[PDB]
Amino acid sequence: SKRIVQRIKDFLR
Amino acid sequence: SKRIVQRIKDFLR
């Protein structure tokens, strides 16, 4: 899921 | 990416 990956990336940035 | 999600899930299991 692109949505899920981007959410994790944004949480950790 | 389904693969990327599954990679993260597997790393944390």
Structure characterization notes:
The structure holds 2 chains of a larger assembly. The first copy, chain A, has 13 residues and is mostly helical. Chain A has one helix and no strands. The first copy, chain A, has one helix spanning 2-12. Chains A, B: Residues 1-13 are annotated as: Active core. Chains A, B: Monomer, homodimer or homotrimer (in vitro). Oligomerizes as tetra- or hexamer in solution (in vitro). Chains A, B: This is Antibacterial peptide LL-37. The PDB classes it as protein fibril.
Helix content of chain A: over 70%
Q: N- to C-terminal separation of chain A? A: 18 Å
β-sheet strand percentage of chain A: under 5%
> Using DSSP, what is the number of strands of chain A?
0
Number of helices of chain A: 1
What string gives the helices and strands of chain A in order?
Answer: H
What global shape of chain A is seen?
elongated
Task: Provide the gyration radius of chain A in Å.
Answer: 6 Å
Helix/sheet category of chain A: mainly alpha
Largest sheet of chain A: none
* Largest interface pair: A-B, 5 and 5 residues
What's the multimeric state? 2 chains of a larger assembly
Give the secondary structure arrangement, pairings included.
The structure holds 2 chains of a larger assembly.
Chain A lengths: L1 H11 L1
Protein name (chains A, B): Antibacterial peptide LL-37
Subunit structure (chains A, B): Monomer, homodimer or homotrimer (in vitro). Oligomerizes as tetra- or hexamer in solution (in vitro).
PDB class: protein fibril
